[PDB]
């Protein structure tokens, strides 16, 4: 009834306290999202400008955003009107509102992936295991129509049919697009997405340890220095006789 399989712990290149994200793997992750997931999954808090200097060149980013139609307005007659995207636009929502999103996924609501790796226990370890973990239901388990069996998803019946399969796309950087190769990449992306600071946050953490180390020491001496007066202190009771 309340049984569940927990995902394992893969050794991500960005797992270390001092390990930055592999920006090469993130550029790919993006491609995966852009050409596969963005079909049902929104990413409301990221924007084309965010890719600049992280995974793409300014040229690239701008063209990447001009590949989309963006509603704007009103004009002079208070009329909405399409237009090409600017680097300041947010990634395109594939549905106008949840109601319609469910309406085209069997009533299932594909969550916005912006903060996903932090909204699910397991983070990328989970997301990964789930993407690559689809399989056949065991003896005695009947999966409702329209649903799929995944042991990693709580309830084992997930509404998302396996999104990735070998060569489903082609990394223009020449990396063998096997299935786990993809999943591995897109997960690395969903991390960068849920927290762009990541890299800088750790570079700081480094500086913090060094100064913290050096400083705690200096002050420990100074504290002992002053206190010595009281530490060495000697007293005697010489009542008069």
């Amino acid at each position: 009834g309340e049984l569940e399989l927990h995902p394992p712990a893969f050794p991500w290149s960005h797992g270390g306290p001092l390990s930055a994200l592999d920006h090469s793997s993130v550029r790919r992750g993006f491609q995966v999202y852009k050409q596969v997931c963005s079909a049902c999954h929104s990413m409301d808090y990221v924007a084309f400008r965010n890719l600049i200097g992280v995974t793409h060149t300014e040229a690239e980013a701008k063209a990447l955003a001009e590949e989309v139609e963006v509603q704007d307005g009103p004009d002079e007659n208070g009329e909405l009107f399409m237009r090409p995207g600017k680097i300041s636009d947010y990634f395109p929502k594939p549905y106008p509102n949840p109601e319609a999103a469910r309406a085209a996924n069997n009533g299932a609501l594909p969550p916005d992936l912006s903060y996903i790796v932090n909204a699910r226990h397991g983070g990328e370890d989970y997301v990964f295991s789930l993407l690559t973990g689809y399989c056949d239901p065991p003896a005695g388990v009947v999966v409702r129509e329209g649903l799929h069996y995944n042991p990693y998803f709580p309830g084992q019946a997930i509404g998302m049919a396996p999104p990735i399969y070998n060569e489903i796309l082609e990394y223009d950087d020449g990396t063998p697009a096997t299935m786990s190769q993809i999943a591995k990449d897109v997960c690395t992306f969903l991390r960068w997405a849920a927290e762009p600071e990541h890299d800088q946050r750790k570079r700081m953490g480094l500086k913090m340890l060094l100064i913290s180390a050096l400083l705690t020491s200096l002050l420990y001496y100074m504290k002992r220095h002053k206190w010595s007066v009281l530490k060495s202190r000697k007293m005697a009771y010489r009542p008069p006789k």
Binding site: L18, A20, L21, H23, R27, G53, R203
Partner: protein, 61 residues
């Protein structure tokens, strides 16, 4: 003897003491910064955009 040279010239006069802290903090910064960034970037070879960069930066078209 630096300790004496330093004490006599820097640490004695509470006014020169301050100049040392400022002048020092400035040097300390500029260096501690490079060093750390240098340690960090090294620990992450080929992963930062600083590295990938050359592949698309004015290399194509």
């Amino acid at each position: 003897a630096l300790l004496r040279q330093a004490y006599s010239a820097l640490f004695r006069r509470t006014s020169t003491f301050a100049l040392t802290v400022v002048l020092g903090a400035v040097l300390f910064e500029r260096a501690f910064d490079q060093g750390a960034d240098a340690i960090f970037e090294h620990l992450n070879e080929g992963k930062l955009w600083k590295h990938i960069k050359h592949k698309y930066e004015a290399s194509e078209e």
